[PDB]
């Protein structure tokens, strides 16, 4: 009653069942045929529930689109320094790290042909590494061996994607470099394996030959890869109604002023005054923009400065905990040019790529930023501009764009001598442009 | 010296002066960048026809160029009764390559000011085969309010007054 | 191009297989003999060359008997035969402005 | 063969230059110098076989401007019937004058 | 501003708890007491004022 | 590859062949005994499961740097493996291999270049490796329990090769054991693994005082100012050989997790180092914030620093912090 | 059977251009718009059509609109064959194209794999790194010179350098070809790369991209740098490995199956690319309305009251910014100097006050006017500074928000905090409308005519009163006289003006209290000044004699001595005096200049010169 094509089988039941042992050990020994057997069962076992009630989705359309299965978590492995050559067609359970991707190139699942007769729309299958061709004409009784052309952009192709992996350096003995292996996906597990997360893959094994000379068919140290059947990572919300009833009693409570004051500090000392600004900053108004004139946003910008070591970072880390989409600043990992406006030479095509800044990247959060008495004055130059027009104007010879930035900020300075050194005008301690005082 | 591409050689690419055989530059008062390039223009007149050998070939091109300039004293024109070494920021030797220091002045003059003031406002009043000819006579008459031998012929004899 | 004197017909081959029989050929490598090959360029002793030029250079192919004897920076003195090799003018067609007579010293 | 860049004068700014090719002819050799601004009065011949190697092979053609004449740096582009050519011929009427 | 540094941070206070259980780890006789931490402040006073000679 | 199996799906006669050098060629389809010799021939293709495959791994050797002559630099050599001696070598193994010798042809551009060059390797036969918890070792654990003597004999144990300074040799042994600070359970990742820094300019070659401790302490990697600077202190992506490039080559802190980071030369490459010291003193942000990825790994390692003074001696009558350049990294 | 199916969709399309597509009769919206689409075309001769997806969906109720997504990628030459059939029956060198637009659903670039082949899918994104304009072929008449080379062959596909089908006589075929330039029409194109938008990027996860060929009149219409939409036909492309000099990843693993064609054994790979047809970039009585509004009387005061609601009071500053917003004259003397194009007015004042409001007002109100802070004074931007060599070219021009104020009023603040080098650089940029550069490469003369407007800061935040502005300007001397007067904003702590400004500000940030009535809109002011710019008012009266005396009276005042102030208002300022005077007459649409109009020009500078003098 959902129509999906995927059954994520735990596949740790055939050892927990008295039968199906020989099935279970054939599964770890011929894993291309046995899935092809099992895909016939689930469609027929679906018919075994369809034959009960004949009022179940018209008995045709959920019987034409095929389904598929996904065995996973089968057995265990330990890494990559165990991959012996005898492991030719087995299941492997990797634990590693995805690094970078590529867009989809197409596959050859069906071909098309037409020679120079008036009309010939045959569609030859391949299902091999070998496209087979005719050498005689067609669609007539007397026409010679004609020139058969290859109208390529007519026959349909599916997706395919290759993804590079490197193992996570798990208990490596402080001398070995973590090496690489690649991936190949076929189904709609594309665009869900984004690069940069912990991974646990469940895949089979395969090896291919390579052409030694680029223009001959001669070949012999092979290259292998794996073929994923099911992947798993390292580990508008669907708004229900019991939450809304639970928050409304909480919204009915007078104590929410202080109940939210106490709940942001599971360990922090009291300091009630900064709890108002930090809470209200995340509760950041809205964009009360008129149609003609105005363009006012309700965003604010609190700051703290003074005594060092007052959990300055962990409070900010706590804010990063409660925000699902935000940014974290760096210690001099960015500059006047290292924020946006990029001319970087990527290792895939050596061409242009404009990657956004961390400021525009927090479109839907709070930018956390630090070391402002130690930030250089070649930079600390665009944040005035985002403080006025909510934008970044890029002055690059690639392009011109006044792209906006719907983002919010807090500041966390540091003293110079030792302290906030009172009975002094404290503004002379923290050096800062009196324009950005405004 | 513009550098080579991959299979090329360190060749020699000129800038301003070697193009301008009979022309114009400007040095007024780029105060920070004064000590940078002034050691390259006062050896264009002294060591006339100058060229150089940085990291390449030792040649010498020919450039019989002409210099004009429009320098600017620090503030007003009579910043002092004290002399010209007090007035400009240049020193003597680079100043001494020139021929004459034409200087301007005006404080207060009734009749001289209108002789500019009445003069300048009339300039702002200066804002099909027969018609292509007739616009030209209009274009000829508009330069000929006092007819001071207009530019249709005047530049043309200069070029063979120099060659 | 190592016999130093006689320009014989070369054998443009690495290893033959299947002599005139139906036997798969085997090769004994303990009874196959080897030799080494090392080129080194020699500058000019830059005191007796008079001041009108940078130092020039030529090169020399020696054999096993005096390899690893030449540390870079030694006042060396070699003696050998003067020798040209290589086809200049025919191995490519039209051959315009390409020397094809390399100076070599196959010495001792 | 002088390759040509667009001079960054009358151009909607903030962008890149563009490239062409000029093939001069016999009595038009080395008239210009490497660096001034010029203008050409050529034709527009598009001869190539169809082999190109910075991009892939395609049904694409490349342009070649064979020039016919050349004049120099012009200035004060406001005229209508004069000062478009350095005519500079002073023979019967001009030289007598 | 003559010789000394620091103005008694709790970050120094939590560190003196850290090294105490460290020395209670190496010399574990299950005696986490006043004398065990008396070994600890014994080290912070001799590390400090190494400049006073 | 050592054996082959082509199937033509008509006769099923799997044609076998010996494996030659690294480049070879498949044969035709009209060569067999049943599926051949007719008007229909089965079209050959390969098979994986019917093709037995072996192990293979390549390594390079250098020389001991003590038997090298006064002259030239040492050179490499190529070695191979077969059988099952595989996965038994390591980078940094002071070892020896016994094996048999053969040269190899080059089979590429053999006429103009590659006249009779040889570029041999050696083929391996044997490896004789050298110099490598209540399990037949408890007798020496009792020797510390029976004799006792924690605060002084162990103080004289580590680094007995100096004059005096029992206070500082005691300050380090407590940090060589560490331990889990507190199993916090909830999301309160507390600071652990305190870091001690030194300063002063003795003439007793202060470098081999500290670094001698590091080369006997567990997993404590040596570093200096040159080389793995504060940008290459973490991991990065670099150039590699013709095999899989853009690997994540590391520095020290991505491999010396939960150990000893014994640094010297603190005034060296400080534009990257001053970021690098804060980012480990800050808990858990050892990352690669590059244009390749934005993944972040752990941080659990102690720091032992030795800052060198300004010119001559540090003037004790003058103000301190005249020679260390980080106030905010130190006093808090 | 599909042959008549394409013939079925041919006439069914044709009758749609025969039937009505118009619901409202004579309330606007004339019936039978497609015949008007023919008739507009037979005048300006552009060779396009423009059909929508709505009216073909709501004709067959999806009986055809679902068919056409899965025919035209194969049946390109069917709809276009039909419109050729209908034009002969209707109209009397002809090459066309089919331009759909406005499908409902808009996807992103990460959703294009399987069903998307031969489909029609609108795609958003942003564009970067264009290329040039070269020609394509689509049809030739090349043939071999065996007997006769006049065979107009077929199939100009992706490898079209071999016309070898059906020779004319019994001759030698595929022996040659001669691609003449004389008979085969071409079409012009460019190849561009796109990129994903900024409000969708999940993380900084190397945002992927693809390429797209646009081939009709779509050429040079995607300006690089905008959020842009597209047509939608997806396409694969090979490389055939032609007769040119050549023939990490396991790429082409799919292509190992693609071996053994009738030509040589290789591996023909593939890559998904894009073909477009039509670009877009989302991101009367009104002509009579001007003729009524030009015949008003108080519209000088109506304009000055209707500038911006973000300020209250101070009509003096409001009169200035309006005149800057319009343009004056620029045409000048023959053979030589081009004079000033406009007026430039700055305003000084204490920061965090009403100074920021005009700056916020104009940058969305003016045509293509840009805003910079100018603190980045050493890299580029304000200071025009050449970039270093990259990808084969040193000495290229740079950006900077100065040479792009063409029909733009650039705005820039905080003159105190920059260095001393730019202070002569923009000083050169003020007098004549060009700048020059010859930095490490050839000389350059770019004529960027401009209109600056500034807001710097006083020396202490508070303006001195008994002194002059000569100390509080915090600049040098000659750039002051190169400028006009600044109309300094003063402040006061008065107990009445605060409460009214409080009530003035609270209705502003109301969610909705739009009770203030500006008599003009944003746009109907915008077209009004667009009516105002297109005159050239010339003085003709004898007030030239009235002009010259008052300045001659004026200059004898501020020259307080032979050794007094060098704020000597010289012959430069007669030019701004008259070029303000044509500008204010360009407000009230009078071509002659009265002596009464320049009277208020004088007291604009009388009130300025008392704000000059102590």
Curated annotation (Swiss-Prot), chain A:
Binding site for ATP: 306-313
A GO-annotated cellular component: CMG complex
Gene Ontology BP terms: DNA replication; DNA replication initiation; DNA strand elongation involved in DNA replication; double-strand break repair via break-induced replication; mitotic DNA replication initiation; nuclear DNA replication; pre-replicative complex assembly involved in nuclear cell cycle DNA replication; premeiotic DNA replication
Protein localization: Nucleus
Transmembrane segments: none
Keyword annotations from UniProtKB, A to Z: ATP-binding, Cell cycle, DNA replication, DNA-binding, Helicase, Hydrolase, Nucleotide-binding, Nucleus, Phosphoprotein
Domain MCM intervals: 256-438
Top-level taxon of origin: Eukaryota
Main location: nucleus
Function noted in UniProt: Acts as a component of the MCM2-7 complex (MCM complex) which is the putative replicative helicase essential for 'once per cell cycle' DNA replication initiation and elongation in eukaryotic cells. The active ATPase sites in the MCM2-7 ring are formed through the interaction surfaces of two neighboring subunits such that a critical structure of a conserved arginine finger motif is provided in trans relative to the ATP-binding site of the Walker A box of the adjacent subunit. The six ATPase active sites, however, are likely to contribute differentially to the complex helicase activity.
Family: Belongs to the MCM family.
Anything else known: Present with 8800 molecules/cell in log phase SD medium.
Name by which UniProt lists this protein: DNA replication licensing factor MCM4
Gene: MCM4
Interval of the full protein contained in this chain: 235 to 700 of 933
From Swiss-Prot, chain B:
UniProt superkingdom: Eukaryota
Name of the gene: MCM2
Location in the cell: Nucleus
Provenance organism: Saccharomyces cerevisiae (strain ATCC 204508 / S288c) (Baker's yeast)
Subunit structure as annotated in this protein's UniProt entry: Component of the MCM2-7 complex. The complex forms a toroidal hexameric ring with the proposed subunit order MCM2-MCM6-MCM4-MCM7-MCM3-MCM5; loaded onto DNA, forms a head-head double hexamer.
Misc. remarks from the entry: Present with 1690 molecules/cell in log phase SD medium.
The protein's role, per its UniProt record: Acts as a component of the MCM2-7 complex (MCM complex) which is the putative replicative helicase essential for 'once per cell cycle' DNA replication initiation and elongation in eukaryotic cells. The active ATPase sites in the MCM2-7 ring are formed through the interaction surfaces of two neighboring subunits such that a critical structure of a conserved arginine finger motif is provided in trans relative to the ATP-binding site of the Walker A box of the adjacent subunit.
UniProt protein name: DNA replication licensing factor MCM2
Motif (Arginine finger): 96-99
Family of the protein in this entry: Belongs to the MCM family.
Mutagenesis or variant effect for residue 97 to A: Loss of MCM2-7 complex helicase activity
Swiss-Prot record, chain C:
Cell location: Nucleus
Highest taxon of source: Eukaryota
Further facts: Present with 35100 molecules/cell in log phase SD medium. Early fractionation of eukaryotic MCM proteins yielded a variety of dimeric, trimeric and tetrameric complexes with unclear biological significance. The MCM2-7 hexamer is the proposed physiological active complex.
Job of this protein: Acts as a component of the MCM2-7 complex (MCM complex) which is the putative replicative helicase essential for 'once per cell cycle' DNA replication initiation and elongation in eukaryotic cells. The active ATPase sites in the MCM2-7 ring are formed through the interaction surfaces of two neighboring subunits such that a critical structure of a conserved arginine finger motif is provided in trans relative to the ATP-binding site of the Walker A box of the adjacent subunit. The six ATPase active sites, however, are likely to contribute differentially to the complex helicase activity.
Subunit structure: Component of the MCM2-7 complex. The complex forms a toroidal hexameric ring with the proposed subunit order MCM2-MCM6-MCM4-MCM7-MCM3-MCM5; loaded onto DNA, forms a head-head double hexamer. Interacts with CSM1.
Family: Belongs to the MCM family.
Name of this protein: DNA replication licensing factor MCM3
First and last residues shown, out of full length: 217 to 324 of 971
UniProtKB/Swiss-Prot annotation, chain G:
Span of the annotated motif Arginine finger: 481-484
GO molecular function, one term: ATP hydrolysis activity
GO cellular component, as recorded: CMG complex; cytoplasm; DNA replication preinitiation complex; MCM complex; MCM core complex; nuclear pre-replicative complex; nuclear replication fork; nucleoplasm
GO BP: DNA replication; DNA replication initiation; DNA strand elongation involved in DNA replication; double-strand break repair via break-induced replication; mitotic DNA replication; pre-replicative complex assembly involved in nuclear cell cycle DNA replication; premeiotic DNA replication
Binding site for ATP: 349-356
Catalytic activity: ATP + H2O = ADP + phosphate + H(+)
Annotated EC: 3.6.4.12
Enzyme class: hydrolase
Residues carrying Phosphothreonine: 540
Subcellular location: Nucleus
Segments forming domain MCM: 299-506
Entry-annotated residues carrying Phosphoserine: 205
Outcome of mutating residue 355 to A: Loss of MCM2-7 complex helicase activity
Alphabetically ordered keywords of this record: ATP-binding, Cell cycle, DNA replication, DNA-binding, Helicase, Hydrolase, Nucleotide-binding, Nucleus, Phosphoprotein
Keyword Cell cycle: yes
Subunit structure: Component of the MCM2-7 complex. The complex forms a toroidal hexameric ring with the proposed subunit order MCM2-MCM6-MCM4-MCM7-MCM3-MCM5; loaded onto DNA, forms a head-head double hexamer. Interacts with MCM10.
Family: Belongs to the MCM family.
Protein name: DNA replication licensing factor MCM6
Organism lineage: Eukaryota, Fungi, Dikarya, Ascomycota, Saccharomycotina
Shown segment, full-protein numbering: 103 to 840 of 1017
